[PDB]
Structure 1
Amino acid sequence: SVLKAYERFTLTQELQDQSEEGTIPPTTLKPVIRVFILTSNNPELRSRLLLFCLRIVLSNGARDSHRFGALLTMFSLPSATMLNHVKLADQSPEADIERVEIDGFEEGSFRLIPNARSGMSRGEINAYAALAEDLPDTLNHATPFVDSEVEGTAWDEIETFLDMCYSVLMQAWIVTCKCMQPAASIEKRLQKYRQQGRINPRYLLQPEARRIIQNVIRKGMVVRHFLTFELQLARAQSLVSNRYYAMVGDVGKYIENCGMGGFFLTLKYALGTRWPTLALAAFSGELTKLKSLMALYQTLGEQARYLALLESPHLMDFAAANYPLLYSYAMGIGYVLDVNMRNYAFSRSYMNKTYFQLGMETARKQQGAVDMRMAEDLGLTQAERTEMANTLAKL
């Protein structure tokens, strides 16, 4: 009963808080991010704006705010109306956006011709043009493209712009929730999307361009908020959709629950396996903690998928330090059960090596073990079980 009090104490303190809806935080000063608005549907203008913006993101000298704005502009370039899609960013409590409606480039470019609506000094028009022509020297051939010719393409048709725009944007999406050498995962993502025809090999970025974009995305909270909103929009899409959002929806599935490996891997291997060692008394308190954490996770809503991206403090609640023994135990199981697990960074401060090996050996010696609620539905006999255990221990 005192033990019953302790279980209820654990679960309620985790969930008391989350009665109320979130309150929008006290207001704070914000940097202004400038996002470019193109009213024209012209393929050549759209493409040069993408190319223009991509260069500012990668440029040596741009401030973070310039880089963020260029990104937000790129991600809005597929829209029929960019303006509506930029207002998505306004939904971020950290965002202060300046829209900068544009109208075109002085051909040869990248000298901005600004819309009537808002002027620009020829100092800043020229300053941007210099910024678009800076670029690091680590990049090969004055461009970010591995193919020193793409930027010289003739953007006569909208098909071509969209093929590049989606291809460039997909590479940004692929590096969205990576803390950052690596990475094997990235090059396999690229290969999936090439074979699906979502990424066109002509428009791959030099690996250096991607690492810079990865960095800007990790730094930019407003940017990440905007990606979250888009990812949610991709969730609500019909089975019959358009090309971009089907694409975003697919890459979104890799991004979901990013940064929460310790929690979900612990569920998968410790509780998923349902081995007899789960009945240890030591796990008892921690088993209640995971139970609360699952309860907490659903109450959070759809957006619990995006805590890492959102930089939410709730990411702290699910930290493995709250269930160190079970985590250790799960890591060991994960270690033998899956070959890919070796390269997971499971090593940690509170990691208890004793329970780690316990998971390891549990997985080797008790694999013949059966879920007796399954075993009874199948009407398994105890001769069948041991000599089910006798094929698997030998294998």
Structure 2
Amino acid sequence: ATLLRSLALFKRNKDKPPITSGSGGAIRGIKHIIIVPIPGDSSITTRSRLLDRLVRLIGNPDVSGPKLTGALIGILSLFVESPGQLIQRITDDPDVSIRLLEVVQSDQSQSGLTFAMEDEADQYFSQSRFGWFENKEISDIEVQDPEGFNMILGTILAQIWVLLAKAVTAPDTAADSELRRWIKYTQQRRVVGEFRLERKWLDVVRNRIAEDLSLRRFMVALILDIKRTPGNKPRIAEMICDIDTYIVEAGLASFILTIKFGIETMYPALGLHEFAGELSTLESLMNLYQQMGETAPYMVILENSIQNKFSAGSYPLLWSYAMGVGVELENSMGGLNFGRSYFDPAYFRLGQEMVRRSAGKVS
């Protein structure tokens, strides 16, 4: 029986994360200065004016790659006291150097904001192609109370964080799903229902989160910082960690649903010998998933190299069995597109057959 433990150790080394800290520092890329307009000063009034001048900055076809990513990092961190020590706390991206600039309110400037460069800010912040709210009776969302801005900012962030859930997996067919979360935070009284940003504003951001990678690394790594906050989180931060249950494991559902339907049901069609090698390369992917730490449900949001390893192509037979168990059990699995060049529908029909045979067949 010496072949067995020599086989299991063979799959616990080729299916092992490589050890690190071997690069001396000659892998770091050419940097890229990005511009994140942080809120200026203690006062609430200028950070509501900053949010107003930076939401309509995004709804603009004339904004670039870095100017839009720095605009989003500028508004995804307005919910904290002193956002400057949050951006440099979170960003460990090696391709983007944060050069973040303070924005203070003024009555001299055209937009109303200067940089702490009085009119140079007006070329930073400035009709049928400007993205804005759906109730476009709105002109400005500048307020002066703290709990007003806390509910307006919580409304704007709650429909940028739900973009992250399927900006990279189902970008085009995300419009119906993300509305069902907007309905969720409206009846929870988390957000205000009036201030729904339109299809064209969100399609700027959803296309942006999909097309660059350092914006997603900022959006993921602050979520991981929200989770570590021990006590009662602040209420926008609780909302971001509430949206997070839709963002985790988003793009690993050829692996999560393989576990949920192929493994956990335990039909008699797992003792097939053709699965016996593929239950071990799925056992080792569950050992690998929990030793990657808290960055493991985001491996395809962060789009690292290790999500090729959790792909269903390494277990093409036991995955198809789990799609057969999956679409026969739930109504919700009927909408899942599983179109791959390794499908083998003879085990998909064997997956459905074990469910239909075991209808009233208590084990």
Question: What secondary structure is seen at the aligned counterpart in 1 of 2:194?
Answer: helix
Establish whether residue 305 from structure 1 lines up as the match of residue 297 from structure 2: yes
Output the amino acid matched with 2:149.
Answer: F
Output the amino acid matched with 2:317.
Answer: L
Cα 1:125–1:250 change in 2 (3 A) is closer
Output the amino acid matched with 2:357.
Answer: K
Which residue is 2:153 aligned to? 165
> 1:38·1:103 contact (CA, 8 Å) conserved in 2?
yes
Which residue is 1:128 aligned to? 124
Establish whether residue 225 from structure 1 lines up as the match of residue 217 from structure 2: yes
Cα 1:369–1:323 change in 2 (3 A) is farther
- Measure the CA separation in 2 of the matches of 1:7 and 1:369: 35
Which residue is 2:206 aligned to? 214
- Measure the CA separation in 1 of the matches of 2:255 and 2:108: 54
With 18-27 and 79-88 compared, the bigger mean Cα shift is at: 18-27
Output the amino acid matched with 2:197.
Answer: L
Establish whether residue 66 from structure 1 lines up as the match of residue 54 from structure 2: no
Q: TM-score, normalised by structure 2?
A: 0.91
Cα 1:121–1:239 change in 2 (3 A) is closer
Cα 1:290–1:143 change in 2 (3 A) is closer
Residue 299 of structure 1, CA deviation: 1.4
Output the amino acid matched with 1:362.
Answer: M
Which residue is 2:278 aligned to? 286
Establish whether residue 8 from structure 1 lines up as the match of residue 9 from structure 2: yes
Which residue is 1:145 aligned to? 133
Establish whether residue 339 from structure 1 lines up as the match of residue 331 from structure 2: yes
Cα 1:82–1:184 change in 2 (3 A) is same
Bigger helix fraction: 1
- Measure the CA separation in 2 of the matches of 1:77 and 1:345: 37
> 1:329·1:359 contact (CA, 8 Å) conserved in 2?
yes
- Measure the CA separation in 2 of the matches of 1:66 and 1:292: 42
Output the amino acid matched with 2:85.
Answer: N
- Measure the CA separation in 2 of the matches of 1:318 and 1:171: 29
- Measure the CA separation in 1 of the matches of 2:112 and 2:43: 17
- Could you list the per-position Cα deviations for residues 362-385 of structure 1 after superposition, in whole angstroms to 9, with x for gaps in the alignment? 1111244455xxxxxxxxxxxxxx
- Measure the CA separation in 1 of the matches of 2:265 and 2:247: 25
- Could you list the per-position Cα deviations for residues 221-242 of structure 1 after superposition, in whole angstroms to 9, with x for gaps in the alignment? 2221121222112222335332
Residue 204 of structure 1, CA deviation: 0.9
Output the amino acid matched with 1:146.
Answer: E
Residue 181 of structure 1, CA deviation: 5.5
With 343-352 and 175-184 compared, the bigger mean Cα shift is at: 175-184
- Measure the CA separation in 1 of the matches of 2:135 and 2:42: 26
With 298-307 and 149-158 compared, the bigger mean Cα shift is at: 149-158
Question: What secondary structure is seen at the aligned counterpart in 2 of 1:76?
Answer: coil
Number of residue pairs matched? 357
Residue 51 of structure 1, CA deviation: 1.9
Cα 1:35–1:296 change in 2 (3 A) is same
Which residue is 1:53 aligned to? 54
Which residue is 2:226 aligned to? 234
- Measure the CA separation in 2 of the matches of 1:333 and 1:261: 14
- Could you list the per-position Cα deviations for residues 304-360 of structure 1 after superposition, in whole angstroms to 9, with x for gaps in the alignment? 121112211011110000000000010011011011111101121100011111101
Cα 1:150–1:238 change in 2 (3 A) is farther
Cα 1:8–1:152 change in 2 (3 A) is closer
Establish whether residue 349 from structure 1 lines up as the match of residue 345 from structure 2: no
Cα 1:251–1:326 change in 2 (3 A) is same
Output the amino acid matched with 2:282.
Answer: L
- Measure the CA separation in 2 of the matches of 1:22 and 1:296: 21
- Measure the CA separation in 2 of the matches of 1:241 and 1:101: 26
Question: What secondary structure is seen at the aligned counterpart in 2 of 1:318?
Answer: coil
Counterpart among 175, 193, 199 of residue 163 in structure 2? 175
Counterpart among 239, 251, 254 of residue 243 in structure 2? 251
Which residue is 1:382 aligned to? none
Which residue is 2:100 aligned to? 99
> 1:57·1:68 contact (CA, 8 Å) conserved in 2?
no
Cα 1:107–1:309 change in 2 (3 A) is farther
Output the amino acid matched with 2:75.
Answer: M
Output the amino acid matched with 2:70.
Answer: G
Cα 1:37–1:191 change in 2 (3 A) is same
Which residue is 1:316 aligned to? 308
Which residue is 1:330 aligned to? 322
Output the amino acid matched with 1:59.
Answer: N
Establish whether residue 192 from structure 1 lines up as the match of residue 184 from structure 2: yes
Question: What secondary structure is seen at the aligned counterpart in 1 of 2:262?
Answer: helix
Output the amino acid matched with 2:356.
Answer: R
Cα 1:108–1:29 change in 2 (3 A) is closer
Establish whether residue 110 from structure 1 lines up as the match of residue 111 from structure 2: yes
Which residue is 1:272 aligned to? 264
> 1:111·1:125 contact (CA, 8 Å) conserved in 2?
no
- Measure the CA separation in 1 of the matches of 2:71 and 2:125: 13
- 5+ long unaligned stretches in structure 1: 372-395
> 2:31·2:94 contact (CA, 8 Å) conserved in 1?
no
Which residue is 1:85 aligned to? 86
Residue 64 of structure 1, CA deviation: 0.5
Structure possessing the higher radius of gyration over alpha carbons: 1
- Could you list the per-position Cα deviations for residues 60-100 of structure 1 after superposition, in whole angstroms to 9, with x for gaps in the alignment? 11111000000010011111111111213432222211112
